[PDB]
Each structure stands twice: as structure tokens, then as C-alpha cells.
Amino acid sequence: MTYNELIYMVLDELKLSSDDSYYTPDHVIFLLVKYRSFLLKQRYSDIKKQIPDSDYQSICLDLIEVPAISGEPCEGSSYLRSKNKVPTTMMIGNPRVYPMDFYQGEITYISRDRMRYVGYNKFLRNIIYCSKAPDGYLYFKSWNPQFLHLEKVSFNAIFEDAKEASEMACPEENGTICKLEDKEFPIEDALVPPLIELVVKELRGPEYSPKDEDNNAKDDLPDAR
Amino acid sequence: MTYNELIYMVLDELKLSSDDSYYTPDHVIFLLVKYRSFLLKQRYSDIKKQIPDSDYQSICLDLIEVPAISGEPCEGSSYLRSKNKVPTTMMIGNPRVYPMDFYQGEITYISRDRMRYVGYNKFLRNIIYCSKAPDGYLYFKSWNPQFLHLEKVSFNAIFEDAKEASEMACPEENGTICKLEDKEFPIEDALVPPLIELVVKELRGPEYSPKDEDNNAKDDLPDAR
Amino acid sequence: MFFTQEDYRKIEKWLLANS
Amino acid sequence: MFFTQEDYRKIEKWLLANS
Amino acid sequence: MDKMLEISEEAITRYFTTLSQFGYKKYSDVDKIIVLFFMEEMLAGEMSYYVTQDDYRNIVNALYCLAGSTCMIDFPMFESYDTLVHSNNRTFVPRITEDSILRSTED
Amino acid sequence: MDKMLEISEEAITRYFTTLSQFGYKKYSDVDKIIVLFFMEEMLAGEMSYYVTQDDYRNIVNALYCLAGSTCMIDFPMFESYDTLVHSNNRTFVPRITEDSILRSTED
Amino acid sequence: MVNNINWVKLPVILDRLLRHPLLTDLNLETAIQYTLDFISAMGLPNVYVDKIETIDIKEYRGELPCDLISINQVRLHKNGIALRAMTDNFNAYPTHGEPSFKTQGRVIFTSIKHEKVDISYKAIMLDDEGLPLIPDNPIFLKTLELYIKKEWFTILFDMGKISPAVLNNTQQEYAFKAGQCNNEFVIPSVSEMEAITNMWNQLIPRVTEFRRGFKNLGDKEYIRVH
Amino acid sequence: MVNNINWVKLPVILDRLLRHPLLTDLNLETAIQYTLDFISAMGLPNVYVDKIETIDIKEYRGELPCDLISINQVRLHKNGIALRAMTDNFNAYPTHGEPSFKTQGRVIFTSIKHEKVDISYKAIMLDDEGLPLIPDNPIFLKTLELYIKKEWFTILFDMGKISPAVLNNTQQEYAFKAGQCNNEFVIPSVSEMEAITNMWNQLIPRVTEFRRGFKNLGDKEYIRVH
Amino acid sequence: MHFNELRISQDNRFLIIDVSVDNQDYFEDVLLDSIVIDTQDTFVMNGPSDNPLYIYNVEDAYDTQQMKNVRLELNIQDLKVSPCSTMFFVYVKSKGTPSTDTPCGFDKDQILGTVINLQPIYKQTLKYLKEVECDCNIPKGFIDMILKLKAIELCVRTGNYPQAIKYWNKFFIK
Amino acid sequence: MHFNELRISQDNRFLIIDVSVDNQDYFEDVLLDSIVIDTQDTFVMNGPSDNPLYIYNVEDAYDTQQMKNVRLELNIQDLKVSPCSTMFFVYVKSKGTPSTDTPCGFDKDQILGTVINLQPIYKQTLKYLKEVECDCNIPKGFIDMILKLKAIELCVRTGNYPQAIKYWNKFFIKNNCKSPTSNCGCYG
């Protein structure tokens, strides 16, 4: 399913069809993207369960070599990093950075804290490690100077913001899908009816609430105007 | 039973007979497929039970040889992938890929994560593997070079979308069925009354909700218009 | 190698080239 | 193309023979 | 020969037909295919001039172990009109009821 | 040689292409790349004057161990028109049904 | 073993397993893996195929057959004297006796420079596809069925899709049938008991059966009458 | 060991672990660590590669090979006499006998000033990649699988994502298979039992096989007839 | 310039070499120069090696169209090599300039043709077929021999003679 | 009629054809009519297609031994096709009448011979060549390449050209080759 189908299901359940409606489809996109992460955490955080393939998305990143701090000699070895800021993954799925082929290569996505201290094991000196720095970029680290030649990776994970990771979606065979509404929403069908129910409950009450409608330099909500 | 019977049963119970109705049969189709997936997971995920053949569905796939990353000498061995994107499966049944004869052939369908490290065992070197990659296609891998000659397979599983797998359904003896409404809905008849009840409950309240009827550059929902 | 005569003539031609 | 020692020996001996 | 060529063409065509429907054929059967087309190459080239009739006998009797071994190699069918028990269409034409000195007699 | 050049260029280009796609190449193969280009500069430098034909034999037969070792190095292809079994296109033309004292004859 | 090891194909075990509707998702892959696991865990010597194959030693090293799993013995081709195991730590290393052998991978480290040796080893009976071939002894088939069922139910119970009592029952049944299979394949037959009888009762003990290929291990020890 | 150590690459364990949906986030990075942990915790000597390498002693000190993990023995290169552990507290320190040695890191402290010594040491069999190479014994593979499974389930149980019964079952299975693997890789073969027998039955005991490289630990002890 | 027949005699006593120059109009000036024979021991990639097995110069035979075609029959025992375990390399040269209208790549003075004895291979195939007759099982040595022969064929047709000799010496001699 | 040399130059420039009528006196009268070149995309079961790739009438030249033997050196760039990813069909038509008492079947006025660039196929096979050295394993890539080539070979020798096209399309239509440089590489 696509963003369009979910959005218009929510709108039609709410009957927000007129262009002169207070709650636009943008409210629907916001609520859908947040309630998706809410439901996924509620279902896949208590105890470890199988996560379907629908909850995931693949972003494609372009890597650039950057200094550790600045251009000094003693400031440590350089890191690669994605050109643009990367979405934050949830901790419920199977995050994986792969070199444009999911079935090959070993690039390990680890925590920020762990990546401070990796590769000291002599047999793990050739493994590329990944983490999202507080800067918001995906930083790469390894002890094997060959890693700095890496130019492109794809990252598959259950990203915490469907909109961000869908905007960073990888080019399809036909070409890029410009409109977000024509892209595919990241959620299993078994979680779609609950998601629509939660969003529709969220906006049902506000839909029929009064407005401060008189232009009279006055607050008109206490009078239910 | 076909899509038509289920759709029109829901519509007739809602009495959405007038062509000038807000909720068309496409709303019904969307809700039916999503609640199908919801009910199947609710019933067959808590513990392992028997899945009847009625919740299963079949598709026809045409396989093409593709490079792992791109055409390069050192980018790894090639793969076989379906020409078109494959619907996501539900991890509740017996997914199976067979060479157009269900009672013959061993083409294993495994997890995408497992498919990286596979075939190293000396006796598992002639087994063909499958997994729906993040691209959306069903990639094939094996160590016995004969697999690349394979041209056409079938795939049986409890698919996440009944509509997507119905569009990719295998040709019948009579021929292809042009209308989705004339295809068999993939759910057991023991699960149909629950499904109809859930969908009718989904659309009962909205069926009688107010609409923003006036064309006056104003939101008329708070006034129950 | 098994040089033919004509190859030798080429060699001396190009050596007496800088004569 | 590639030469070995023996190739150079043949070439130089054949030069000196005809000089 | 002109028949080993046909058998080999049929065998490899069936082999690749299976690799089209399936993605696997027994390599114990690919070995028989390999033997078959190696013999086809050797007998239809410059190596056949070393063949005696004893060698031909042994080669044929070794090839017929491949006959019904797999689906790819199949028993060849030749043009034959014989059998282990032949028919008796001779006709009896007695002459003037004439017995010979001991035996009977016909035309 | 002019071919060790091509093989070395291909090998190192493939090496850096892999380091572009992936971020890792086996150092057991970087060893082979090192040996290959070291040999080529050895043979295309001022040290090509110390080689006999036996040394050439040994160098070639040792470099052919690197041929199919990794994908970076490939088996070189040369322009060849030979084979282990050649074709016989000679033609037969006897003289007016004649023979020698022991055997046949031709034009 | 009292009975004979008649060989049958791997999918027999899937014919028996898939009767359980909770085991319908098994495949030939899983059968192959868990069959190899079971064959190794039981380690029954009657399931492997005895073979003999001669190799040549280059210099204290020799190439080993591809299908080898365990070596019964190694001997010299010319003399027939068997080779014991290596206790040395400095075998082929010179500075400035009894033959021995040692095997790690595809290579055999012997204490002899240039000789040929015969190796009596054990391998797996393979299928025409090239797959492992299992006995049809219904005790073996049942115990392998229970092994595969136990692994599958362990996985399901880890997800929480099987009751603990079901897994406990499966483990109990598999344990008993594992004991039954071990006794089935190891207890000597009548002829093996004759061999053991001739080996046990010996007025003049024989303590040199290893020099021969354990050939006279079961030979009856005769005493002349006076 | 009865069986042979046929070597296979590390992801053969990930072939088997990732069948379990709760172990799908394991990687070769994790496989390497937990495999090395299992190799060391088991301490099986048949898993290591026997190597011999000579070094020179500068002054009661020598450089040690890179891949050394343990030393089987050290001997003098010219005499062949083996070395013992150095009990002395003041070896290379003068004031104002039988040779020995000691090894801590990349340095070996012998009691000899200038000599060459032969060290028979054990290392790890590596792959074409600089990675460990594991035996394909299905007992070993199953035990390593259970080790990695048990560690991962311990983590998930500390998080509260696994039922305690699940972890208890995993630990029980791993304990039994750890014992099974320990016995499998330790119990002698028939050829090794000949060595043990020759060592055991000795009318005149031999108590000086340490001086040699334990070459004659397993030779038969032949008494002449009078 | 090409080969008419390059074969070892069925009696295993002569090595037949029958060379000819191509019939096209612009090899009228081109002739045949020499015949150099090398074995698996003395081969070098860069043309014929030094100390060859047998050199032949074709003016010696004749006293011009006769020089465009040559036929040799060398008693192999006179070459002091084994006819059964020897792989001969036969070089030929032109000593002649073609015209200026030659299409590119056709003007090449030298060629090469490899030779081996097919009798031992024939005997091995007969032996393996005899084995197959008993119980109708294919020996794996037979398939190995077939595939190794195909490997040497590929090496020869691709010009990779070093690895070709490596396979020959490793498999079909020892 | 018969083929003397039917080949693509290893530099991937020239499609070489060399036809010559049989030297036996039965066929003294018969002469070559035309040379028609077809590819796998312009092939028909019987006779050349009505949309061939190249036509060459022999009689538009000196008109008798010159007529009995014909040779072509067609450059492939003028044909607007790829030397390596193309399989050519060479049809040769004869004009004349063979004298009576020739055994039947020999009097076939038309002859067909195919062409393929085997160098890229050898390039593919070399990748799997070294599998032959490694014992304990089946050289599956080597076997697969050999069988792929021999499928086309046998299907050609038996006249089963359509399945030959199908196999060529399945296997070798995606072959790559180094296009020859127009500036003639100078040597000799």
C-alpha cells in the first residue's frame, strides 16, 4: 500500500473531503508517521518477535571522507560519513548497512557507544562499523585503510520516521518517485487497521470542536463559538 | 467465494446501494484485504496451528539473471530474480517456491538475513534459495551453476496483500480472469463472518456521519452539517 | 627468439639511422 | 615484446660479424 | 554413424530443458552426458581411424549401459522386421497323391 | 612485453573498483597484485638484462599460478589458430587409375 | 549389529515427519542438516562405509582422500606393518624407529620420507544425486524423526508457539529412542559375539593384533593336546 | 580423536544459527568473537595447527613467532635436548645446569646466552581471509551454535525479551552438547590407543620421553627371550 | 599462411608437417622460410627458443611456387624424443612482404601448431569403456580425463601454452 | 559446394567467407550465384529472409574458375552489427545444372553455414578453467560452459537452427567484446 491509500482511508473515515477543512492531509501524514512508530514500539519492544519485511525501508547513502575533528595531524584517523543526515533507526528490527547488495558484504551497524572501541581484536581489524553520531550523520570506522574508498552503501532498517527514510528512498528501476503520496508506506497490514483506528480516534473529537470564529479582537472559545 | 460476493455482502449489510454514496466498493476492498491480514495474524501467530489451503494463494514468476551489484568482474556471483516485484508473505504458513509442479522440486524460500551465509555445507550446494530482497524482488542464489538456467517458477504462500497476489495469480486452464472481482478471495470460510463483522463495524459509524455539505469557504463539520 | 635475417637488417638500418 | 640475454648476444655477435 | 549425433543432440536438449524447468540435474547424469558426447566427438573425427571391429563392439556394448540409464539418454529404435519366432507361410502342394519311397512329395 | 602492462592495469583497476563497491579486498589477493606489478616493473626496467631464457621460462610458469587465482587477474588470451587435433584438408587425385609397384599414386 | 544396514533415500524421513501437521514446513535442506547432525552425534560406526585407498608419501606428508571422515588404520604398502599415532613434537624437523602417522585436514603427517601407505577409512554412503543415504532400520528412522521433531519444537518453544509440556514429552521420547538406537547398533551379533569370545578366552594372550589389521583378533586360540 | 578435522569456513555456523528467527541479527563480526571464545573455553588441542619454527637467542632472550598460542616443547637445535620450565628467580642476573625456558609475550626467556632453539607450538588454522577456520564436525558445529544461541538468549533475557524457561532449556542443551564435544575431541582413536597401550605396559618403565620430543612415548617395549 | 595437415603418423614413427601459404592474391611475394620444432621442455612464449629440437631451412631442399608448399616427415626416433609422451610445437616463418592492400591483422609472419599422440588417449578411453561395461557405472577417472583434455584444448586455443604444459605433465605423463 | 574457410577474424573486424564448388567433374557446370548473409533476428526456416543483412551476386564480376571459387572479407562495421553478440547465417546459391549420374543429395543447389565468435566464449570458460585442478569438487562452471557451447554445435550440425537461435539468445547474446580501433594498428 501507498501513503495515498492510507491518507485517504483516514480522510474518508473522517469525511474530510471539502477543501475548506481545518484538518488537511498534512495532519494525517504527521499522525500516521508518528502512530506507526508508536505501534511498532508497542508490539516489538516487550519481547523479541519476528518483524515482517513490510516494516523495513532501504535508504541509499553517499559517503565522504571527513576528518575526525579537523585537519590536524594528531586529531586521529579519518572517518567516512554519509553526505546527508540519516534517519534514526528503531531498536526493534534488523538494521543492516549493505554495499548495494543485501546478500553480500559485512558492514556492521552498532551503537554509538560501542563504536568508540572496536577493531582491537586482531581478527576484527577488517570489519567496517557504522553508527549515527549526535551530529545526525552515519559515521564509518575501521582499522583497514581500504574502507575509505567506499563510495555508496544502502541501509535497511525500521526507521523511526517513515517520511524521512522514504524521502531518502533508493532509486527504483523506473526512476525516482517524486511525490511521497506515491511511495509505499512502511507497515504490515496486520498493524494498519489499528493505525487507522488510532488516528481516526485522535482526530474525531477535534473534528467537531468549536472555533474562535468571530473576528472581534476576542477569544470566543469559552462561548463555544 | 469470490471478491464480488464478499464486497457486495459488506455493501448490502451497510446498504451502500446508491451510486451517490460516499463509501464506494474500493473502500470495502481495501478494508477487506487489510482485515484479512489482521485476522490471519491474530489467529496464526500466537501459537502454531494448521493453516487451511484456502488462506494460501499462488503467483507466477518469471526469472531473469541479474548482477549482484553491477556488471563487474569482482562484484560476486550473479543472482536470479523475478521480473516483477513480489508481494510480502506472512510468517504463519508454509511458503513454498516450486517449478510449476507442487509435488516436485526443492527451491527453498528462506529469510533474507539467512540468505547471505548459505550453501557452504558440502551437501547443500545444489539447493536453490529464495528471499524477498529490500528492492522488493525475490532473489535466487545457489552454488550449483545450473540454477541460472531456471526460467519460470511458482510461489505459494499466505501473502500479505490478497490483491497484489491476486493480480500476479497463475493463469488458469480457461485463461486469465480480467476482473479482480471474479477471483477467489484467499480466506477460510470459518474466518469470513468475523471479517465481515469487523469491516461493517469499521464503516457503520462513518456511514451516518455528517459531511461538510455547504460550499461556502468554511468548515461546516462543527455545526453537524 | 629465432631472429630472421630481415629483422637483423631492420636492426642495422635503425642503428645506422643515427649514423 | 621482450628480450633475454641470449637475444642480445645473438644481435651483437651478428653485428660484429658484418663489421 | 549419423545416429550418435541425433542421440547426443536429444540428450543435451533434454538436459537444458530440465535446467529450464528445474535448476538441477544429477551430476551423476551429467557424467553420462559427458561420456556420450565425448564418444560422439571421438568417433566423428580424426580419431576413428584407430577403431577395429573389436573396438567397435566394445564401444557399442559400453554405450548401451547408458541407454535407459537416464531420461536424457533413451534406447535407440532401428528399422527391424524380425523376431525370435518367425512365421511359417510355406504352402503345401501335394502331387498326384504321390508318396516317395519313404517321405511324402510336393511340387 | 606490452601485456604485463595490460594485466597489471586491469588488476589494479579491478582492485580499486572493489574498494569502491565494497570496502575490503582479501590481503591474500593484494599479495598477488603486489607480486604481479612488481614483476612487470622488474621486466620493464633496467633489470631485464639479467634474464636468460630459462629464467624467462621460470618467470612465466610462476606467473601462471596467479592467472585464475583471483578475479582481478585473468587468464590472458592470445591470437591462436591451433588445436590438439587438426583438420585434414588434403585432396586425393590419382593418375588414370594407376599404381606404383606397391601402392597408389597421385598428380 | 544383529540386523543389516539396508540403505534408503533421505525423503523417507520427510514422509514420516510431515505426517505431523506441525512439521509440514520442513524441507529436504533441514532433513539433510539434521540427518548429518544426528549421524555425527550418534557416531555409529555401522552407518559409515568402509573403504581402503593407497596414497604415496612425498616427504613426511601425503594427500588424503576427499571423502575421508575417520581412519581405522594406516599401514605400509610393502611390509603391511600398521602405523601407530604420533607422539612426537619434532617429527620432520632435523637438528644440526617405529613408524607413526598424524592427520589434521586433507594431509597426513607420517614419519617416513618416501613410501606408499594403505589407509582404511570410513565415509558416508552417498546418493546418486550426491546426498547422504540413511539406513531403513525403523529404530534409526524413528530416532531421526524424533531428533528433527525435537529441534523444530525447541525452535517453536523459543518463539513461544509450543507448550512446555509438549517439548518435554518430545525430549523424553527422543532420549529413550536415542538409548534404544545406541543399543541397537552397538550390541554384538552372534558372529561378532563369536569373534569376541575367541578374543576373550585365550590361555596364551595375544597382544599384537594391531601389527596385523586386527585380522586375527577373533581367531580361535588352539592348544595342542599332550 | 576418532574423526578427522575437515576444515570449513566460519559462516557455516551462520548457515545454522539464522534458521532461528530470534538469531537473525547475528553477524560474522559476532560469529568471530563467540567462536574464538568457544575455541578457548573448550581448549581442545586437535583444533590447533602443529607448527615448528626455529629462533635464535641473543642473550637469554629470543623473539617469538606471531601466531603462537601455546608451546608444546622447546629444545636446543644442535643437541635436540628438550627444555623445562624455568623455576629460577635470578636467571639472567649475575652475582658479584640443565637448560630451561619461560615465555610470557613475544619474548622467550631461556637460560642459554647464544644458541638456536626449536619451538613446537600451536596456532589457529586460518582462511584465505585472515579469519579463523573451524572444524565441520557436526558435534562441534552444534555445540558452537548452542554457545552463540545461549549467549544471545542471555542478553535478551537480561533485557527481559526471553522467557526464563527458554534460557534454561538453552543452557541445559548447551551443557550436554559441551560435554559431548569435549568427549568427542578427547577420547583416543584406535591408533592412539596403541600408543597409550605401549606407554602403559612396560616391564622396564621409560620415564625420559621428555628429553626427546616424546618421540618414543608410544613405542612398544620388546623384551628378549632367554 | 596455414597448415594443411599437422599430424603424428598412425604408426607412431613419423611426425607429418605439411604447410602451405594462403591462396589469396596478395601473398604472391610471400614464401615459406623455416620450420622450428620445440617440445614441452624447450618452449618459450616469445617465438622459438634457443637450442631447439630440430631446425629446417627450406631453400636447402629446392634448387618459386615449389617454395610456397612444403611437406616434412620426421622420423621421431631420430629426434631422440618419445613419440607417446611428447608435445611438439611447430613454428613456421614467411620471409616475405605482402602487398600494401592487406586487411589489417592478416599480415603475420609466424604461426604455431601443437601436436600430441592420440593413441594413448584412445587406449585410455577403451580401458574406461571396458570398465563401464562391467556394472554400467561411469568411473570418475574417465570424466576427469575428459574434462582435463577439454582444459588443454581451451588452453591451446586461447594460447595459454604454459598452463597447458602444466596440465599435460601433471596428468597425461605422470 | 562446400566451405573452405568460414570464420570471424580474431580482431573482431572481418567476417571471412571462402566458398568453392567441389572439384569433382559432376559439378563442373554448376557455378555460384549469390551470397546472402542473415542473422538470428532475420532468419527464416526455409531459404534466406526477404530482409537480409547483405547480398552479393557473383555474376556481377569477371565471368570460369574465378566463378567457381569466391572469397569475401566483409568488414562488420559496415554491416551495423556487433561481431561478438551476433550469429551469422551464410547462404550460398548455385546457378547451373549438375550432370546426370551424380548420386542424389549431392545435387543440392543451396548450402548453409553458420558463424559465431568463439573468443568471448573462451573468455567465459577461462574463468572456470581452474576448477579442473581442484579435486574433491565437480567443475560445474567448466561443464556448464562446455555444454552451452556444444548445444549450439550439435543443434547446428543437425540442422535444428531455431533451437540453436533460442540457445544463443539464452546464453551468448549478451556477450561483450573489444570493438576494433578504426586506426589500423600497425605491425608486421
PDB file of C-alpha atoms in Angstrom, chain H residues 14 16 37 158 166:
ATOM      1  CA  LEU H  14      25.637 -18.738  10.390  1.00  0.00           C
ATOM      2  CA  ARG H  16      22.689 -22.900  11.014  1.00  0.00           C
ATOM      3  CA  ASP H  37      35.549 -17.612  22.908  1.00  0.00           C
ATOM      4  CA  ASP H 158      18.824  -9.634  30.769  1.00  0.00           C
ATOM      5  CA  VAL H 166      13.641 -20.734  27.210  1.00  0.00           C
TER       6      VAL H 166
END
